[PDB]
Write a protein that binds this DNA or RNA. Structure first.
Ligand SMILES: [K+]
Ligand SMILES: [Mg+2]
Ligand SMILES: [Mg+2]
Ligand SMILES: [Mg+2]
Ligand SMILES: [Mg+2]
Ligand SMILES: [Mg+2]
Ligand SMILES: [Mg+2]
Ligand SMILES: [Mg+2]
Ligand SMILES: [Zn+2]
Lengths: 343, 49, 132, 223, 51, 14
RNA sequence: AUAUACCGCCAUCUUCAGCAAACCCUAAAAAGGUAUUAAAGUAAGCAAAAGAAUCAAACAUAAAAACGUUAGGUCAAGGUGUAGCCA
């Protein structure tokens, strides 16, 4: 009957079962799920299966100065228009499945190391197109509640950097993953450290630190050495702009303690100019590829001192067994210094 | 012509029998209808007044 | 919980018109009636026929103006005259509306044997009462 | 044109005491106002010991020579900020001096917040005040502790927003985050009244100098 | 791989600009195949052309 | 546990 | 056939007081965020409140009551997804 017919909005709402209880509690292993479609997309007002032509609706009202009259397309002509519409209908469907590849991260099914774009513009149109955002951890934590039982939120740890020394990190939490991405991405832009790079490609000196139970041992390296570090450190180093460094992480691999410990050490390092001012002496550099040629990298800003820095006969430095163990002639692991792709 | 005459004219020309009188047609002076709002609290230079 | 004619709350991104926002208990309080005839007044006949005609007249206008209706139509019966007042979006060309008005009037006047007139007020886009 | 604007803004920074703030105060003037009186030794903060002259029978005494040096720097900085038309906000939670500090700010031409400080006032200003609210360029903390003997929330929140802070810091206070700390008495009415006058005279001099500096340079353009 | 995916790229001793991309500018060492991801057949061809 | 993976983002279905 | 795919229309805690979203803060945050002689919370929506109805006024009664809970009830009001019948 014509009186038992409902609108498309009501037909799709029921058929899709989106508002149904089962979907809300996630009680189905979603597959082969119905996909909504708009059926008025390619329909032109005035076009029917019978192929009638209506002046002023689906055909020109006046043609070559002649006032048109009602007409109908021939069976052959109608079969052509019907065929052309089918081609357009199929063309749209194939485009729906077509997608644009995005680079994966550390693994194919993980969010770690995935670029999610720049942070959003600021209050006064402060664009951050020069900044890139990378994900370091996505966790599905749970808070037990009386109303909802186990309740799930998305906790995202991201880092941001412009590749020119400025970088920061933040954590964003929400019930939806997309929201946690926005919260963390725009929060991290408010916590930008500036990291000092020696000659724009490496740290000024070796850095050893313990943050909580995570240990990091970074080493200054020459050009062309590349990043040989934890995958998270490679991601953060690319954001900062460091190009050549070695690092080892031991103890707990907590991503937050590694991110906080990394920025802590990298932000509290000492540039050569700072050391020259503190001690009043020239800072000289000796490269083995330049021979004995002395290279002055920093000169004291004020008055140059005349008391030589004391050189002990035997220094009391505290050495790490791992570094010293190599020069003692002990064997390294089979996993050490394996051939890897350029980082 | 006054505000009282306006309300009488609008009630004749647009008869509404809605019980709530906030929902009935109205042609009131803008001061009565538009909520008077606190103005800007600082100048162009940005110094609060 | 009552579900009748109630557009529910989401996250503040759902536009709703004035008609949709108000639940059934606001009928005769904040919003009026879409149809106005004399068939439900006391001691009056032919309520069933006026109600059946309205149901059809609303499905007819939806199909005849697909995607061009900004809000529900208003039906006004005076004597044997029928008047259809519809808010219609400005999607179609102007001459197309003149075709559908002449067609829908003649067809519905020869179907119910009464003079039927169509009144169209064009809006630039749907009017949003509130975001719920 | 461009030279005049450079002269107005760049000339003041070539003189050690462009506004002559040294004359406003003296070690004797501070000693009359009881600015050398500190809390008992038990209430002493570890980061205030540099500024303490000694312990006179349990009561820490504040060196008024360090106070004079630090006050000169703080008053000098407050003058250049006022000279450049920056926003200055006086902040305190001591209720005895709430009316005096609000009256001082009004006399200077600046701003005072002596009431309960809302969380997020500076870190979440746009929500609390509006889209394009201009935050203070300098915050003067006549008192750096709240009424529960904890640091005023605006000390950390002004550092988070990178706003310089001139604060009076008594022996029990924490000056580490105060950009220009002024060691001195914060409890006595005569000490607080002296500081309020100094900040008020200084700001009015800097504002007056700018008016005169503009007229002289502006007059030169036609002349 | 980078060489094979682009047919117009040709590993020839005369095409020095291409060969430079496979040699370290700072150390002057030819990169091992895992570094750039070239297949072993092209890496052997690249090494001979650079030499 | 399956639809929260980056598959949809890494394919381009935005 | 399946209300354990659903729309539609309801029951229940319920005339219970909460729900959701945008921000901000934490020597890290699984979460939490109040003190008024105030100590980190803030500015808006839905519900409540108000208002309207029972044809003066009040009170009362109705109506109203969010988001969730019970895979609650209803494929037999109607419509509809999947599967099944078509001498
Ligand atoms: K149901
Ligand atoms: Mg895979
Ligand atoms: Mg004190
Ligand atoms: Mg059920
Ligand atoms: Mg109510
Ligand atoms: Mg059941
Ligand atoms: Mg059936
Ligand atoms: Mg049954
Ligand atoms: Zn290859």
């Amino acid at each position: 009957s014509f009186f038992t017919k409902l609108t498309a909005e009501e037909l799709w709402k029921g058929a899709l079962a989106e508002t149904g209880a089962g979907a809300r509690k996630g009680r189905g292993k979603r597959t082969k799920k119905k996909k909504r479609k708009d059926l008025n997309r390619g329909q032109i007002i005035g076009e029917g299966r019978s192929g009638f032509l209506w002046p002023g609706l689906n055909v020109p009202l006046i043609k070559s100065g002649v006032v048109q009259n009602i007409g109908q397309r021939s069976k052959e002509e109608q079969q052509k228009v019907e065929a052309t519409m089918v081609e357009q209908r199929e063309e749209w469907d194939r485009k729906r499945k077509i997608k644009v590849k995005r680079e994966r991260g550390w693994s194919g099914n993980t969010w770690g190391g995935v670029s999610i774009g720049p942070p959003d513009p600021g209050p006064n149109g402060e664009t951050y197109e020069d900044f890139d955002t990378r994900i370091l951890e996505v966790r599905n934590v749970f808070n037990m509640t009386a109303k909802e039982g186990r309740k799930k939120s998305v906790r995202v740890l991201v880092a941001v950097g412009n590749g020119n020394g400025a970088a920061g990190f933040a954590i964003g939490k929400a019930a939806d993953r997309g929201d946690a991405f926005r919260k963390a991405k725009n929060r991290a832009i408010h916590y930008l450290h500036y990291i000092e790079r020696y000659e724009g490609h490496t740290i000024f000196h070796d850095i050893s630190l313990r943050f909580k139970r995570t240990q990091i041992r970074m080493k200054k390296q020459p050009r062309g050495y590349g990043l040989r570090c934890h995958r998270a450190i490679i991601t953060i180093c690319r954001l900062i702009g460091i190009k050549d460094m070695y690092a080892r992480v031991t103890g707990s691999m907590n991503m937050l303690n590694l991110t906080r410990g990394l920025f802590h050490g990298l932000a509290r390092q000492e540039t050569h100019q700072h050391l020259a001012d503190k001690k009043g002496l020239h800072v000289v550099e000796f490269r083995e590829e330049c021979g004995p040629l002395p290279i002055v990298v920093a000169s004291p800003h004020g008055a140059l001192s005349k008391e030589p820095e004391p050189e002990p006969e035997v220094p009391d430095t505290k050495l790490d067994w791992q570094d010293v163990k190599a020069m003692q002639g002990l064997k390294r692991s089979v996993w050490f210094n394996l051939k890897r792709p350029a980082t | 012509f006054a505000e009282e005459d306006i309300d009488r004219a609008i009630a004749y020309l647009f008869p509404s029998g809605l019980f709530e009188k906030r929902a009935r047609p109205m042609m009131k002076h803008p001061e009565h209808i538009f909520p008077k709002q606190r103005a800007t609290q600082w100048g162009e230079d940005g110094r609060p007044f | 919980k009552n579900r009748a004619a109630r557009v529910r709350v989401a996250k503040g991104n759902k536009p709703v018109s004035y008609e949709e926002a108000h639940a059934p208990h606001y009928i005769a309080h904040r919003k009026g009636w879409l149809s106005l005839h004399t068939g439900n007044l006391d001691g009056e006949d032919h309520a069933a026929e006026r109600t059946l005609e309205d149901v059809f007249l609303r499905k007819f206008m939806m199909g005849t103006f697909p995607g061009c209706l900004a809000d529900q139509i208003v039906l006004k019966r005076r004597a044997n005259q029928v008047d259809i007042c519809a808010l219609v979006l400005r999607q179609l060309p102007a001459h197309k509306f003149y075709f559908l008005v002449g067609y829908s009037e003649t067809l519905l006047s020869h179907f119910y044997k009464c003079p039927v007139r169509l009144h169209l007020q064009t809006v630039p886009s749907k009017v949003v009462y509130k975001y719920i | 044109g461009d030279d005049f604007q450079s002269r107005i803004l760049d000339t003041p920074l070539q003189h050690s005491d462009f506004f002559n703030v040294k004359e406003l105060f003296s070690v004797k003037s501070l000693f009359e106002a009881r600015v050398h009186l500190g809390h008992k030794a038990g209430c002493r903060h570890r980061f205030m010991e540099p500024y303490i002259f000694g312990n006179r029978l349990g009561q820490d005494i504040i060196d008024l020579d360090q106070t004079a040096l630090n006050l000169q720097l703080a008053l000098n900085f407050t003058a250049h900020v006022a000279y450049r038309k920056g926003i200055i906000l006086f902040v305190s939670r001591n209720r005895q001096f709430s009316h005096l500090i609000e009256t001082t700010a009004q006399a200077c031409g600046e701003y005072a917040h002596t009431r309960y400080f809302k969380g997020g006032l500076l870190t979440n200003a746009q929500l609390l005040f509006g889209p394009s609210v201009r935050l203070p360029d300098l915050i003067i903390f006549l008192h750096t502790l709240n009424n529960v003997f904890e640091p005023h929330v605006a000390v950390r929140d002004a550092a988070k927003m990178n706003i310089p802070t001139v604060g009076i810091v008594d022996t029990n206070c924490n000056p580490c985050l105060i950009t220009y700390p002024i060691p001195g008495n914060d409890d006595s009415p005569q000490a607080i009244q002296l500081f309020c006058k100094l900040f008020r005279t200084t700001i009015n001099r800097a504002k007056e100098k700018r008016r005169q500096m503009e007229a002289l340079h502006r007059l030169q353009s036609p002349k | 791989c980078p060489i094979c995916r682009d047919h117009k790229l040709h590993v020839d001793f005369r095409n020095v600009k291409l060969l430079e991309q496979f040699v370290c500018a700072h150390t002057g060492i030819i990169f091992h195949a895992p570094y750039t991801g070239v297949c072993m057949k092209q890496h052997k061809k690249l090494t001979q052309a650079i030499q | 546990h399956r639809d929260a993976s980056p598959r949809s983002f890494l394919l381009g279905e935005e």
